[PDB]
Ligand binder design. Sequence first.
Ligand SMILES: O=C(O)Cc1c(-c2ccccc2)oc2cc(Br)ccc12
Length: 188
Amino acid sequence: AQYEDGKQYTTLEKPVAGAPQVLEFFSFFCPHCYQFEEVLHISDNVKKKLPEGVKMTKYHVNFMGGDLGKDLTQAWAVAMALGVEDKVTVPLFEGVQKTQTIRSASDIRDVFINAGIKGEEYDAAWNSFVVKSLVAQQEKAAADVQLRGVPAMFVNGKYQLNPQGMDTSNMDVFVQQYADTVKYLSEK
Ligand SMILES: O=C(O)Cc1c(-c2ccccc2)oc2cc(Br)ccc12
């Protein structure tokens, strides 16, 4: 077959009931995740190949970066609760990996302040029980699939994308193969 288990995707041995339709895991410490955001725009390109209104979910993970990795999962919960993901994704990636100016929870907060989120608004979300629950949701979703690596995509709780089985001589072709595989899996 053109799409084969083990080539473009793998199949979870223990599928996850009630998982999001399209679920991405990433870390701001993750070098491939940086590339998936700024160089390849994987999420944008996957979204353009799926029907309108399809739910794409993106969660941060704890297992990269120690204390700061957990702070970043909480900050992503804040970004999700406030709806400011598109405002902070690039400054957070570049603060961690390009300029290396993010070293503390206060440095993360500065990114949100510079992006126009009010200090009281950020701090109130950071300490909120809604954010505590969003943190739990992200942890539970990664636990459900026993996640050991990022960037990762899962489709319908059953299929995991396999980007290493994909051609990387051309960045544009790679993105297209990845996006077309998600479409195929979403229709499976
Ligand atoms: O090097 C590869 O075979 C595929 C790949 C990955 C990747 C590999 C493993 C897990 C997640 C992603 O990221 C890339 C980014 C850019 Br630009 C170009 C290629 C890749």
